[PDB]
Design a protein around this ligand. Sequence first.
Ligand SMILES: Nc1nc2c(ncn2[C@@H]2O[C@@H]3COP(=O)(O)O[C@H]3[C@H]2O)c(=O)[nH]1
Ligand SMILES: [Mg+2]
Ligand SMILES: [Mn+2]
Length: 328
Amino acid sequence: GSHMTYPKYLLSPETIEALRKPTFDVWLWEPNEMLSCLEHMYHDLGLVRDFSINPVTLRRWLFCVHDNYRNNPFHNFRHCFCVAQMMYSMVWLCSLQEKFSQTDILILMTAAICHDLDHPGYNNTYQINARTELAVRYNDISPLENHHCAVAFQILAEPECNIFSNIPPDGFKQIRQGMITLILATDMARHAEIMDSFKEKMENFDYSNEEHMTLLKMILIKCCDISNEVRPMEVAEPWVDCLLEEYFMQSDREKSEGLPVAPFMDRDKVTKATAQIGFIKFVLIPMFETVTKLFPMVEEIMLQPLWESRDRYEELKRIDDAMKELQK
Ligand SMILES: Nc1nc2c(ncn2[C@@H]2O[C@@H]3COP(=O)(O)O[C@H]3[C@H]2O)c(=O)[nH]1
Ligand SMILES: [Mg+2]
Ligand SMILES: [Mn+2]
């Protein structure tokens, strides 16, 4: 309803409102628009207010985080924007502010933004098997994730980027610990371990028990990370071709360098459909089923799109298969 046009990085009222929901079209926007969005999130969640974040530093820091993501097909700035924007969505969808402190929100949000810093676009198995410098550096223990985390704090140690410069040190120590746990929790090698620890607490969940809360925070960041398929089908789908783009780059290389190839990155055997049916049925549906025991509104906003996406890929596979029966 506006009297004149604004530049793009002046988000409109429509965009700001849309940003609260997981229907948001994470493809519409260029990096500067995404930066303004992340910025708005910090103000709107009251984090600028409650941690005295100098607002120019907030901007400088985000631009700096941006600079430290690489131009990978999948593990890129736009992916961290998805993860952060889904977390933002979740704060509203689950009323996380009723249950969590502002320090906990700061952790969730900053860990979402930082959780894949400087990802080289080849996973931990490649690093370990190739004996990369990262694998040697981190002794084969969640090397990518430990690195993302280290880069996060290197950025924050530069004073012009230090969004925590006005938090007292006890606060800093606490945010740092949370963020480390959360970013490390994103390594999928630990998925069943973390899911088991959570389910065990979920036998008698207790919002006043820090250990219960830490596990909830780890499940929350894990949901957000692997949440592409929760989004509308037109927004979700292009991500799968990016993921395969990386997975196939890795397996080419592995083949070429004599290293073990994983069959789920095997060009000859893998399909969008075959990639997503299992990942939806046996990773995403069940994780969100348990979150849903705490947050039942999660069913309708997030389990439904997943059921729909599983059903669609199942159809797709039926036709892809028909189609390779014209071949070979
Ligand atoms: N098959 C499939 N795997 C995914 C999908 N989304 C995330 N993953 C995997 O989950 C991993 C989680 O952390 P990263 O974001 O470091 O790398 C991710 C992918 O390997 C998806 O939509 N489909
Ligand atoms: Mg990761
Ligand atoms: Mn990620």
